Amino acid sequence: QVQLQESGGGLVQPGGSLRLSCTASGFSFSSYPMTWARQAPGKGLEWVSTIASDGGSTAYAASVEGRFTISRDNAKSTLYLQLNSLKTEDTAMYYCTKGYGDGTPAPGQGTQVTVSSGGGSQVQLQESGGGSVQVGGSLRLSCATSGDTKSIRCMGWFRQTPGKEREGIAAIDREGFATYADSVYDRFTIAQDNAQNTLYLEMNALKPEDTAMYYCAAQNMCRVVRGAMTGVDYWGKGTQVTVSSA
């Protein structure tokens, strides 16, 4: 049974960003193309974007081309829509469907996106990609920035393990200049895709000492010493990374 559930909608101002998720169950999600469509008050269901089963092909409506990006994580049976540079006319209920745009959402589906000058000015950060890996292994963390993200000048990563002080480990500006804590240098890489409102932490050569809750952080004015941000304005809720040997 095909079961889809959208999330990540909300209220932003023009020029803001949102990241929609659609979690799939009850079918081989990775075998099928998937689609986002949207319905604005008193209008028909409009096709927005389609992505191939394997993620390697995409298509977009002319009205969103260059602003929205479809993606998927087949290991997590989840479909995403990154909504950058939001406009008032992007306001709609957004729906995920199996296939190419001929599918109809089931009752109960939908996440509301509202783009309004009357929305608040707020930033939200959300990490993902934590897991349990072996010593010497690799992991990639992501951080989605949503809301009024235009003010951000620098982003970075912190970590904290039970019993120890939080540690700032890497930071980066919009031009891509980065610094690192000595503890992670030449093992971890921070990268971004600010066109896509995403920050990454590529983690290689993992050690047990790397086991920690990892958090992303942002600020409106860059203040960093050796990878460690001070004067942090915004921060996420955390993703756990556990490095062990069995």
CA distance 26 to 1: 5
Superfamily per CATH, domain 3-115: Immunoglobulins (2.60.40.10)
The experimental technique used to determine this model is X-ray
CA-to-CA dists, residue 83 to 8, 22, 106, 185, 188, angstroms: 11, 14, 23, 33, 28
Top CATH class, 123-240: mainly beta
Q: Each residue of 118-146: b (16+ CB within 10 Å) or e?
A: ebeeebbbbbbbbeebeeebebebbbbbb
Instruction: Give the 3-state secondary structure of 88-146.
Output: HHHCEEEEEEECCCCCCCCCCCCEEEEECCCCCCCEEEEEECCCEEECCCCEEEEEEEE
The H or E element containing residue 196 is none
The H or E element containing residue 29 is none
- Who contacts 53 (Cβ-Cβ below 8 Å, separation ≥6)? 30, 31, 32, 33
Residue 150: strand, helix, or coil: helix
Resolution of this structure in Å: 1.8
Give domain limits for the chain.
3-115, 123-240
